[PDB]
Amino acid sequence: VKFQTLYNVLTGKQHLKDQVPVKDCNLTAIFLYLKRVDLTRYTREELTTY
């Protein structure tokens, strides 16, 4: 059930409250797309700026 909900969050079919973004740190603390999560760990500003 919860695993299915996690899979739905990664799929984007189900979203979090108050429009919270999906991140590995965010996901870890709650509990091709996966490569995008590991990317999500790294700071966005650092990636774009550098």
Partner: protein, 48 residues
């Protein structure tokens, strides 16, 4: 001259001045804390 020494010390250890542990508990995501840190550094450079 004391004040100049304090600016040099503050630039050398900007993070030491802040309470890192409190802010780190508080922020769910590290990125938020990082943005706060960047703004403080820029403000000190503008001050001097």
């Amino acid at each position: 001259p004391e004040l100049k020494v304090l600016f040099k010390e503050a630039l050398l250890q900007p993070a030491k001045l802040l309470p890192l542990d409190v802010d780190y508990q508080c922020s769910h995501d590290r990125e938020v804390v990082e943005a706060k840190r960047d703004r403080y550094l820029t403000a000190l450079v503008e001050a001097e």
